[PDB]
Amino acid sequence: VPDYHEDIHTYLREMEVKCKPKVGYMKKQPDITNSMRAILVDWLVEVGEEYKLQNETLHLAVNYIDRFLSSMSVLRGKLQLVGTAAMLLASKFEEIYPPEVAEFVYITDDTYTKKQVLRMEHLVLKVLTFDLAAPTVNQFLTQYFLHQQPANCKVESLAMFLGELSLIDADPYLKYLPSVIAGAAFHLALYTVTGQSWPESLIRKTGYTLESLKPCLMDLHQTYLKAPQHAQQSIREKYKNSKYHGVSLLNPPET
Amino acid sequence: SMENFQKVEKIGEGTYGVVYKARNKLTGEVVALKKIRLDTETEGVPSTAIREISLLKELNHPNIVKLLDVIHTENKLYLVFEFLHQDLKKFMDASALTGIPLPLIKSYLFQLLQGLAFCHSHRVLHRDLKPQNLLINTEGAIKLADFGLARAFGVPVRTYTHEVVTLWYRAPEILLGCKYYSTAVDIWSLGCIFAEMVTRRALFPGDSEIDQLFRIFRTLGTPDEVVWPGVTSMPDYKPSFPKWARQDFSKVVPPLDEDGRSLLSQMLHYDPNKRISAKAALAHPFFQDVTKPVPH
Ligand SMILES: NS(=O)(=O)c1ccc(Nc2nc(-c3cccc(-c4ccccc4)c3)c3[nH]cnc3n2)cc1
Structure with a gap:
């Protein structure tokens, strides 16, 4: 509804700072x-x-x-x-x-x-x-997905997977706002599948450059690489399924 | 908790139980006290109350009924609201012999659009705009009022709850059983109500989904793939629908001027992507001379 995309993005950015x-x-x-x-x-x-x-x-x-x-x-x-x-x-x-x-x-x-x-x-x-x-990582991901050309079912599901994994480990993810955990998840997903980076349209829309994302992105990279041995495994099982295109299976990248 | 409030009289039943008039014994404020009944069974606190209270804590706007306080007692939950004198349903019945003056109708549409644009820009659709829920005061204000069927939306939307506005004010994309509706459903409601203030009677007063939908077709014409791409493959489209011709809007609302007709047609575009947004509508020529007269 591009009339309220920006108003709502702006408003959920005000709001995530208050439900912190x-x-x-x-x-x-x-x-x-x-x-x-x-x-x-x-x-x-x-x-x-x-x-x-x-x-x-x-x-x-x-x-x-x-x-x-x-x-x-x-x-x-x-x-x-x-x-x-x-x-x-x-x-x-x-x-x-x-x-x-x-x-x-x-x-x-x-x-x-x-x-x-x-x-x-x-x-x-x-x-x-x-x-x-409350704003969630998911409400940001969802918005972010519209700046993706072409759309890519694999990218989205993987992005969701990493956003969901971030809910398990309170250390380190409690310190990052949801709009950021989303940023990272999205870019990490985009690189893992299409090999592209956080696009410029999303820099214009959020003000997060690829370098402001770095801290969180470093942690998410590690949660994802270490995800098979992690004691809690229900999220991994969830995202093997056809619905989410089996992206939990997709082997993570080098850096 | 209630030590403070003295009940005056019942006022009505809304979307989750009873609303009363009351006086704050100490400040003298008059309020509307909505009583919810709770039980270690009722599935505890109603889904409708949870969304109303939470969404309406977020919506402070001069054209949205303000939620003042929420009182948990042991088995009762009371929502304290600002009190308005009357609703637009009652007011249109009382204003039948002489009609509502055009300045007032314009004042009221403008203010409602303001309230809606606000809601929408905070990711909230009302999903129940009708005259029973638009309250007025003696000063010439009007406000949106029953946020119990509202929901927070995402961008883009999900499939939400299906049979959703009261029939008369229900938009065609709901009646045709689409996946996705968004903000455009409230604008459609508001366009219907705008018609109703002008003519003093409901624009599409069906008593079933199919009757409601044929009524709309008879006035806007039966939508085909040109005016509404997608339409003929929507879940509750039938190729056996009759094909009525679109009527000129000078005949739909005869009192209405060159501009009000334009506005109203943009509010009732069939396609929800081209249908005017509340935010855009505030800028429409119709309102170039808007003011704020008083009723009653
Ligand atoms: N009947 S009348 O036109 O003379 C009339 C008289 C007084 C009020 N005051 C009032 N009603 C509702 C409210 C909310 C939801 C539903 C209703 C309602 C309206 C009409 C009939 C039954 C209930 C009122 C409010 N919600 C928050 N604040 C409120 N204040 C409304 C209508």
Whole structure:
């Protein structure tokens, strides 16, 4: 809708700066760790599969969890309750047919009651101050894809894959804004398949040159190269499938 | 929490339960208090309330009804809104014998377009523009009002929820069952309402999808591949549709001047890519002499 492409890009760039979780948060949590959070984010992906939830839902669920945990300490025993309630909300916000509450209770193995899941939803909303319309790496990728000539189904799916992998590892990816994690993912995808670089149209549109992307791009390069041995593997399995053209399989590049 | 507010009277039922008038006992402010009922069953908090509250925290604009506060109690959720005196449905019924003056109709279209352009530029479609949800005050303002069927869109769009505007104000790309609709669906609504203020009766008042669609065809003509590329292979197109001729817009809205006709035709272009955007419409010649008169 080129009338509002720019207004919306501009506005989601204002907004991502305000839904920013505190980078340090993990260090301040008494009980949980970057690799408990990885288990949790990998588990949500598997839930997203089991109910054919949209990629957006997953990405919002993670944005809600990182903000939640930015201001609220959570024991390991409840980390998943936080994740469940977040994934419920994301679904309600984003999906045409969100899963019933009962379905989320069923996928925690009844380690939580329905009564709990609803109370947590109320609390996650109180702490997020009802501000659930968060920018995500996915909303930037999607916009970015229109500056691609020709369009390339392989590039897009790989770009999405790297954007999704970035949700697992809170260190280092918590420090990068979503518009940047998108930039990197897109360029890394474009190089891995077509051998082209971040185009000039996207420099004119975002102001990110290929060199401002470098820091993040260095990390994403490594997550991608080390992705086979990484303990959480649901995202890799996801992107083997025909839908996403099997790009998780595609062997990463040299530098 | 509610200690502060005194209920005056019920006002109506919207898209998720009851709206009341109320007084802030301490500031004296009059407000509209929308009550949602919650239950450790109801799937907790409604999807419609989640989108309304979250989207409307983002939309502060003088032509969008302002959300003042959100009160969680134990089993009740109350949304405190600014109160407006009347809606455009009631006002058109009360203004039937003498018609709405052209300056006022123009004031109101301009302000609604302003509210819409704002929504749209913050990635929000309303998806329920109709006179019941456009509120007016005695000062000559008008505001958009039920953001409970709204949703945040992406660029480009996804397939969103299907049976979606109230029938009379539903755009043809929904009725024909397309994948993608976007901002253009709200403009279509607003064009219908613009017609309705001028003539005092609904432009395409069907009682089914097919009836609604034939009504549109009889006034804009049956779209073919020339006026609407793609059209004849959309999911709910039928080659067995009748072929009506497009009517001259001087006959669709006889009170309307050379320019209002232009605007209105751009709002009701069949193709959503050529259909005027709210933002572009503010610049249209029709509005060169717009002002802000008062009603009532
Ligand atoms: N009936 S009337 O024309 O004399 C009339 C009188 C007062 C109001 N005040 C009012 N209504 C709604 C509101 C929201 C959604 C739906 C409705 C509604 C409108 C008509 C009938 C039933 C409900 C009102 C608001 N939402 C946020 N603030 C609001 N303020 C509306 C219509």
